[PDB]
């Protein structure tokens, strides 16, 4: 069916610019109107604007005039947003759905973001990439420290360990920097996987 | 924006309407309202469009209606799967048209039994120790409803500096998890009898102690 794929999570230092991809398939690309939505972490939905892909014209939000640049490329049905001057504030998932269709006299109806991306959070902060300091919680779990961006993923006794496991959502330090702790509920290791740094750690839990 | 209620809740099996207030220049101009439902960690989900036309796959229980300035959305039969992040949309633009969301609403099931806090202390690692640091971990994760209150004690006498808590989330069992962190030093940490996590849940707490020795 209709599905749209955006590109991966990028992590970027305030000031620098990215570039988004929204891959439409299932649907004919110049059909229908293109628009961007973000939601920062834990908070509503903002409107950005649209694009015409069959005209390339585009609109956006007041707030968005100035630093957003919407473009299209038919011939591989990619649209592509370049965010421009990233504030930290300016951390969000950003989303592209499809609007309805681009010529004047409408058929079938406005159905508005009938269809969405998986997302692309965009993190940016003044923190560098860090590699997280994993250690064990001995019984009577792991403690993932330390580590930007999020990310992180826990595997255990090299992803064989499945049942008991519980995986806490992360705090963002003063520091810039997120911890986590995953507890277990006959040879135990830990093995947490940083995608966005490359990252692995073993270690034991004895 | 359009002022949406923060949030609302109702009992199982009943209906509530879920109001998307507006000006003139959107809900009042136009037809084209639309309603989207948000789960934790998904893309929102079209649910209404068109003030009152339902998509494919959308259950006959989710009604949409407007009245002059006001949107409203009603949920008819509410199942616990219902339990989401409400938006409402709306065109709008004069001679400028653009897309205008809402704040959002989320919305609670009630009937959920509530289920007293499950707290487990972990001491400092000493290969966390050899790194000339030191954490302990407040772990609170079987607990309805979802509001704590963490508080750290060393020898039985508060502290407050270097608590790094996160705020409650769900889990798959449906009830509600926290975590709490106190970052200390060695130093710290090897000069106190005792150190404790008290969590208070609905005027009740549960306090473990943990000892260097």
């Known amino acids: 069916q209709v599905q749209l794929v955006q590109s991966g999570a990028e992590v970027k230092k305030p000031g620098a610019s990215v570039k988004v991809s929204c891959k439409a398939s299932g649907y004919t690309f110049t059909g229908y109107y293109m628009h961007w939505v973000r939601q920062a972490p834990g908070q509503g939905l903002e409107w950005m604007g649209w694009?015409?892909?069959?005209?390339?014209?585009?609109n956006y939000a007041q707030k968005f005039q100035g630093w957003v640049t919407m473009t299209r490329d038919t011939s591989i049905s990619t649209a592509y947003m370049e965010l421009s001057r990233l504030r930290s504030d300016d951390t969000a998932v950003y989303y592209c759905?499809?609007?309805?269709?681009?010529?004047?006299?409408?058929?079938?109806?406005?159905?508005?973001?009938?269809?969405w991306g998986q997302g692309t959070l965009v993190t940016v902060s003044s923190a560098s990439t860090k590699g997280p300091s994993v250690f064990p919680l001995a019984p009577s779990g792991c403690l993932v420290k330390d580590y930007f961006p999020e990310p992180v993923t826990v595997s255990w006794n090299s992803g064989a360990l499945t049942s008991g496991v519980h995986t806490f959502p992360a705090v963002l330090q003063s520091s810039g920097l997120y911890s986590l702790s995953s507890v277990v509920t006959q040879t135990y290791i830990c093995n947490v996987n940083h995608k966005p740094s490359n990252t692995k750690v073993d270690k034991r839990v004895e | 924006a359009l002022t949406q209620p923060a949030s609302v809740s109702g009992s199982p099996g009943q209906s509530i309407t879920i109001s998307c207030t507006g000006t003139?220049?959107?809900?009042?101009?136009?037809?084209?309202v639309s309603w989207y439902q948000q789960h934790p960690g998904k893309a929102p989900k079209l649910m209404i469009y068109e003030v009152s036309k339902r998509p494919s796959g959308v259950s006959n229980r989710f009604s949409g209606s407007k009245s002059g300035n006001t949107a409203s959305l009603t949920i008819s039969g509410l199942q616990a799967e219902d339990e989401a992040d409400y938006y409402c949309?709306?065109?709008?633009?004069?001679?400028?048209?653009?897309?205008?969301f809402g704040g959002g609403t989320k919305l609670t099931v009630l009937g959920q039994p509530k289920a007293a806090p499950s707290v487990t202390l972990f001491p400092p690692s000493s290969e966390e120790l050899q790194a000339n640091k030191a954490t302990l971990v407040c772990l609170i994760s079987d607990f309805y409803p979802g509001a704590v209150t963490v508080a750290w004690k060393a020898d039985s006498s508060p502290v407050k500096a270097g608590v790094e808590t996160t705020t409650p989330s769900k889990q798959s069992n449906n009830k509600y998890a926290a975590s709490s962190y106190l970052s200390l030093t060695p130093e710290q940490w090897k000069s106190h009898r005792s150190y404790s996590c008290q969590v208070t849940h609905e005027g009740s707490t549960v306090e473990k102690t943990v000892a260097p020795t």
């Open positions: 759905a499809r609007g309805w269709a681009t010529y004047y006299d409408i058929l079938t109806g406005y159905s508005l973001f009938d269809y």
């Open positions: 949309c709306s065109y709008a633009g004069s001679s400028t048209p653009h897309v205008v």
């Open positions: 694009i015409n892909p069959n005209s390339g014209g585009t």
């Open positions: 003139s220049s959107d809900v009042g101009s136009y037809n084209l």
